[PDB]
């Protein structure tokens, strides 16, 4: 329930963004946060966190996101 | 004697709701709030359709996810209002102490005057056609999903801007303080030159705008150049 700083590499052209997340956040809620803050529609977001393609209902905690500076890759679909 | 007025009003209000409204739980929280002189009133997620007179000492009003169409007068020390996910058609006059206002996901048609200490304004998913003049300490402006035809000039500490899914035809010049600008799905045909002067870590999303051919060449002559050090601009 402490904030985590997530390093995100976005590839559609690339950009690196810093997100602030909570470990109990679902991938669905992450997609919603990024939709509002960056404009990427949830249906077009594909999240990779540690060798796995993250599914909407999985938590960041379940994918090993635990400490500031942890990384995720975001790919944007056509 | 002041307390009796409030307890009486809340008492009367508790008995006049519809059966879905969790008025009894609200009455108890208001009571605890007033009698402990509590800083935050949290009536969120209590299916309320109106609110009564509010405890005058609160600095945070947490009323998200109810069914409110209007608010009562806002107590004059409020610093934070979380009113998102209601059915609000308008907001009352805003207290001068107000710093954060979240009224996203409502039905608001126009906003009242924005007070001079406001730093965060989140009013996405409303029905706004125009915005009030923006105050000088504003750091975050979230107005995506409205009906905005135009947007006022940006004050010079604005760091985050989201105005996606509007009808905006012209974008005012962007201050260097801006690190994040969501402009997607509007009616822009040109961009202000100041967009190229934002920081290298800055982000601009301008997808879904009918940017002209000359605009596209003008910008990409700079953004595709080898010595480019301006922000990352997403065009699609």
UniProtKB/Swiss-Prot annotation, chain A:
The chain holds residues 53 to 132 of 510 of the full protein. It is linked to Polyglucosan body myopathy 1 with or without immunodeficiency: A disease characterized by polyglucosan storage myopathy associated with early-onset progressive muscle weakness and progressive dilated cardiomyopathy, which may necessitate cardiac transplant in severe cases. Some patients present with severe immunodeficiency, invasive bacterial infections and chronic autoinflammation. Residues 15-77 are annotated as: Interaction with RNF31. Auto-ubiquitinated. Auto-ubiquitination leads to degradation by the proteasome. Phosphorylated. In vitro, phosphorylation inhibits auto-ubiquitination activity. E3 ubiquitin-protein ligase, which accepts ubiquitin from specific E2 ubiquitin-conjugating enzymes, such as UBE2L3/UBCM4, and then transfers it to substrates. Functions as an E3 ligase for oxidized IREB2 and both heme and oxygen are necessary for IREB2 ubiquitination. Promotes ubiquitination of TAB2 and IRF3 and their degradation by the proteasome. Component of the LUBAC complex which conjugates linear ('Met-1'-linked) polyubiquitin chains to substrates and plays a key role in NF-kappa-B activation and regulation of inflammation. Component of the LUBAC complex (linear ubiquitin chain assembly complex) which consists of SHARPIN, RBCK1 and RNF31. LUBAC has a MW of approximately 600 kDa suggesting a heteromultimeric assembly of its subunits. Interacts with beta-I-type (PRKCB1) and zeta-type protein kinase C (PRKCZ). Interacts with UBE2L3. Interacts with PRKCH. Associates with the TNF-R1 signaling complex (TNF-RSC) in a stimulation-dependent manner. Interacts with EYA1, TAB2, TAB3, MAP3K7 TRAF6 and RIPK1. Interacts with IRF3. (Microbial infection) Interacts with hepatitis B virus/HBV protein HBx; this interaction is required to activate transcription of the viral genome. Signal peptide: none annotated. The RanBP2-type zinc finger, also called Npl4 zinc finger (NZF), mediates binding to 'Met-1'-linked polyubiquitins. The UBL domain mediates association with RNF31 via interaction with its UBA domain. Residues 4-65 form the Ubiquitin-like domain. This is RanBP-type and C3HC4-type zinc finger-containing protein 1. Induction: By viral transfection. Belongs to the RBR family. Disulfide bonds: none annotated. It comes from Homo sapiens.
